[PDB]
Symmetry: C4
Subunit: 354 residues, 4 copies
């Protein structure tokens, strides 16, 4: 027979990709009440966070105020690189002056990125994130390897982003201290549409973990998360931390401009590959928009960790390491409709559901 | 090969979960006209109802008036536990003073729940429902077992909620007289979203029944039901009764406040894990809302049992026990669209379809 | 392993049901241009129609004017039975007085239905349709068998409706001259929702045909059709004719009341199991509504047969009998979106697409 | 067992058809930055384009201005045939007078189409496109074969449209220099709805390529494309070029009338099988509408090629021939929702996403 989906090559369509809305965690036998769950997890090989959450390296999400707030809440911020090197380094210093808090900073690849990285290290950064649209190439692997060789002793080096097992494996071989996963799932991202390229985020995590976990390298699940439950799903798929843009962009600490329209409150949120971000040869792979204002970061993080704690209680996971062993059930569109509230008019805002 | 959905573990995504909108009952050879169908079914091992329906233990669904009405209609109510012990016990007495009608009452786990249970038994309750978000743990199993040991002679003890075969089996082993199934399907429930945890309700029923039916323990299908046909589906999947919140919350007998907006009529309906219910450490797993007013309970129950009777006629099921042996066909989104009315503007309200 | 969808019984969920929007006909080698296609097909064992279309036996679709128009267009009407026996018989006579045109009439089961049938035969009806919600029972089979024994010589006897192979086989064994398929697909039908019972219409046809075709008994595909392409699909699945309600209810010849609202034109269309039809013990299994006015029947039939002719050209089918051998490809929701016009604002009405 | 979808014939439903929104390209190891990608590709056996894009032969898409613009941008236009032969030939001459640019022209089948073809060849056309709704028949195959025999030396001859392996193979055997694929995917097309016939476009490409690629015959993927990413998908499925209607109809160079409604700007765009096009025996297989105005063609083509270049960078494809070897992952509806921007209000127009 021909392949059921066309042509004669069984490997042309190589797998079925799932994302967060395709799966649910199965409850299991539990001696863990949400209050007693330990939410700590490895950000990188050497760095463990109290709360397994980091803020996106975006000019509408993370600058010093967000980095400070995230660290105090037990996570970490990654300072964006859409600003001069001296300014990014200064923001690292600001976070460092606020109580020796952990902080990360994004860099690109090449000579200017090298100088940026060295200035960030001098400023006391804890984590360098080599942050690129496509990490599966010699330029990114060389950057990760060279950084580890030169400053690896004082700084952890993260590489990303990937969406496959082989790209995750290449980053592991280059010496990455963590691997960041996500090609296209971002709320403001058009990569999958403009280039046609990506992998659904749950499958991308499962695949990257298949390479990283046996090598003891933590995986950061970056993009596509919209609810506390999605964080539990990402970790159960094998990630060690989750990176958030949209969920944090509406908070007081995000550096986006505060917007008032139709008697409502918003903040700007835009892709770093949007036309506006690139200006402030490649065609854009993001859009510019706004998200509703969500109040203080601390309260958002509390709701997110609370949802994670519930998941740990339901699945009998005393630690994140046990949560990573939980099982999924795949669901249909009807299952998804059933999972959200349905057939009711919401009359009151919930702090963890809008 | 890697698993088609990612990673190398075939059991990571353990099954495909179906819910009501994913399946239809197949018609079969029949000598049963709807009028002659026997809708009676076991609520628990010792208690058989004339109509296999019970009202949810929620502060917007079941208080004494609902409990009285449900019992008179041939089902039963489960009195909610969001009120002082003396008041819940008093409501049991009110139902009991109205003609020796059957009544159930929810309790939690722990010392206060124990005192509540003893007061309810003293008041003459027929069924205690140990009613928890997650029953697969020693606390709930111990509560069920201790209740059966102490008052098991005069009261039936139900345990819930579960969504897996193993959790249903644990409750059976603890001595449960029925097992209640449903993690996340409720109309006002956000568990699946906030915690990421659950199982689509048809599969959850099939799995629980695989453990309960061979032990002679009835399964209560709790949550997610929106039409009379869904009740037939739940029973065919193997449940013995169905528990309803949304479908009954809009009735005259529900204790929710009656609301007038936009020239229309509603009643409040809220999750017992909503912020408003919890107040009146855990983050909410429900929302607060309203549902349209549906009139007297009796008329709603008549329409629901009528739909069930039709299903029994179509499937050749003279009893609920035979309905539990019916077969399903799985359907696609197109099948679902075809099942509901389509391509027509409804001009008149139907008593059993809105 | 447990069954992937739950429980331990592989046959509990017995198959995957497809309907019209799930499939497309594959083009094939062709020496048939649409103009040369022969659209004739068996309505029953003895009766062949020029156009393989019949109008539904509904009080908002078929009375004498529709029956006359359908016959003149090369199809047939089935006169509804929601009126006194003498009136239904009179309408048969009216059609018969209009040029010896073919006509059918619906009857139920039991004594009154028997008298109705005899009066219809006396009036010259060509086809009796034993027309019931569920045909898989002794009452319907006996009616079909008795009618064939008593008047089978002068009248063709159709039985319906079924949605399974075994029910189709029972009707064949009872002596049915055609078998009508459709449990729940109707536009105004709530059977699948109220009772939870049915089978998606393409699979229902495939299954019924598996029983009827080897016995030389034509299958009438009844309900769910919305476009000319759906007719081609039904016939390719193995049906010999298609029965239409919605598509014909908006025509001038339908007996529904003509409605003017919002500067637009509609006609009433209602299920025969709607509360309004039943009045003019069972709960309703239909709704009451309206459909847009579509003009003269002849023009609608021309567009429908034109679409069928195109399908025959694409599939290389010179006759309906060859069309019944065509192949399908199954499609996804994306495939369905692609099939309809997309990403364009329609500015002009098309005669065969709204 | 019966076939899981109904009946006893395993080949009745022959395969599962995918289209663009069902798949994503997997990133791969890459030494190709978008800037260095070579986007050139074969239009036909003898003609290679700098940009693998051609404009649809439609009266609202391609006349001389569009043909000139496409050629200058490195693609080609196919002049439509809904106008007198002398006028179509004149437009060929106009394009030819503008710098020896490449140009194609559509013809039908039969005597008038033959005269049209000869006049187009005399006028200097580079490519004749035998352009029919259904190419799998002797009339079209004879036309292709006769054209190749008579003028094959000076002109390339394309045949279409097909949606199957066997029809593609027949065109290859007839001597086609390229095969054009697409039955029903067009934005303005109702073929799949009116006739019920077609195949989802990715599967159609895979199937046609299975016949054409081993014979060295390029495949033109015609219809259904809405984003730059879709072009990358079509080429990865094995096509050598993509034909665009909707994406180009809104450009300044399209010959559609410019429309002003609601303070917005549109241009007319209609199917060539719409009632309006056919007039200016068959029932229509297209609709008439409008699309938003998109500005100069050059800027649209730049955005489209930019997206393609990104895909080549992500997949490590230095040439289109390597892109044709890329792998897909199949996605679910959740995956598709995740791929587009989600959970954000777009506040600024993006040049490559609306
Ligand atoms: C314009 C786009 N921006 C972008 C995309 C995803 C996420 C974020 Cl945060 C951003 Cl700012 C991009 O970098 N696109 C892009 C698209 C494809 C690329 O391929 C290679 C590359 C680099 C080195 N060797 C081989 C390939 N680099 C590429 C860059
Ligand atoms: C806040 C939430 N409320 C809720 C959830 C579902 C339905 C209803 Cl009616 C309600 Cl009121 C809840 O109880 N969440 C929750 C979430 C996870 C839990 O895990 C354990 C637990 C208890 C004892 N041992 C182990 C785990 N208890 C848990 C409780
Ligand atoms: C009320 C409903 N009406 C209806 C349903 C489908 C299509 C149409 Cl046109 C109509 Cl008017 C109906 O007849 N429901 C119904 C529902 C289930 C039934 O089971 C049996 C039956 C009859 C004889 N033996 C066994 C079962 N008869 C049944 C009748
Ligand atoms: C009316 C329709 N128009 C149309 C359809 C698809 C795309 C475009 Cl651009 C157009 Cl203008 C059409 O040509 N329909 C149609 C539909 C089925 C046909 O079958 C044969 C045919 C021709 C020669 N031998 C056998 C079959 N020719 C057929 C033509
Ligand atoms: O413009 C872009 N194109 C593609 N991805 C982006 C772009 N900007 C940010 N991202 C990614 O999207 C993530 C945020 O996704 P979110 O949490 O779903 O909003 C970031 O952490 C980046 O990985
Ligand atoms: O806040 C909550 N979170 C989760 N489930 C709830 C909550 N409150 C009530 N439930 C469940 O939802 C069921 C009612 O679902 P419904 O019939 O779909 O509205 C109840 O019987 C409980 O099992
Ligand atoms: O009230 C009803 N309930 C269920 N089916 C109905 C009812 N009334 C008519 N039908 C069926 O629906 C068909 C018409 O479907 P339509 O062509 O999709 O509108 C009829 O030919 C009957 O088989
Ligand atoms: O009326 C029609 N019916 C069917 N297909 C059409 C019709 N007119 C144009 N087409 C096809 O649709 C393609 C354009 O599709 P689009 O790029 O999705 O708008 C053309 O290149 C033709 O192959
Ligand atoms: K829910
Ligand atoms: K229906
Ligand atoms: K289309
Ligand atoms: K996205």
């Amino acid at each position: 027979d021909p392949v059921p989906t066309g042509g004669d090559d069984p490997h042309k369509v190589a797998m079925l990709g799932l994302t967060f809305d395709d799966v649910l965690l199965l409850p299991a036998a539990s001696d863990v009440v949400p209050a007693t769950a330990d939410t700590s997890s490895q950000l990188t090989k050497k760095i463990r966070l109290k709360v397994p959450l980091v803020s996106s390296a975006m000019d509408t999400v993370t600058e010093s105020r967000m980095a400070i707030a995230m660290a105090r809440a037990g996570g970490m911020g990654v300072l964006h690189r859409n600003l001069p090197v001296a300014e990014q380094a200064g923001q690292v210093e600001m976070v460092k002056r606020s109580g020796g808090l952990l902080v990360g900073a994004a860099v690109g690849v090449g000579g200017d990125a090298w100088v940026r990285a060295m200035m960030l290290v001098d400023a006391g950064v804890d984590v360098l994130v080599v942050d690129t649209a496509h990490a599966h190439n010699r330029l990114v692997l060389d950057m990760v390897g060279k950084l580890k060789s030169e400053v690896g002793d004082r700084v952890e080096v993260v590489g990303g982003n990937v969406a496959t097992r082989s790209a995750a494996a290449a980053l592991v071989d280059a010496g990455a201290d963590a691997v960041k996963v996500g090609v296209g799932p971002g709320s403001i991202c058009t990569t999958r549409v403009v280039a046609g390229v990506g992998a659904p985020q749950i499958t991308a995590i499962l695949e990257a973990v298949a390479a990283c976990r046996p090598a003891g390298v933590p995986v950061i699940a970056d993009g596509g998360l919209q609810y506390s439950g999605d964080i539990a799903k990402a970790l159960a798929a094998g990630a060690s931390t989750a990176m958030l843009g949209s969920l944090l962009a509406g908070t007081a600490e995000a550096p986006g401009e505060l917007i008032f329209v139709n008697g409502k409150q918003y903040k700007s949120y835009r892709g770093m590959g949007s036309l506006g971000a690139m200006r402030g040869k490649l065609v854009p792979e993001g859009i510019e928009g706004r998200v509703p204002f969500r109040g203080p970061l601390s309260s958002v993080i509390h709701q997110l960790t609370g949802g994670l704690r519930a998941a740990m209680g339901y699945t009998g996971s005393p630690t994140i390491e046990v949560l990573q062993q939980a099982q999924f059930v795949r669901i249909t569109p009807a299952g998804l409709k059933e999972s959200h509230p349905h057939d009711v008019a919401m009359t009151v805002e919930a702090p963890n559901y809008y």
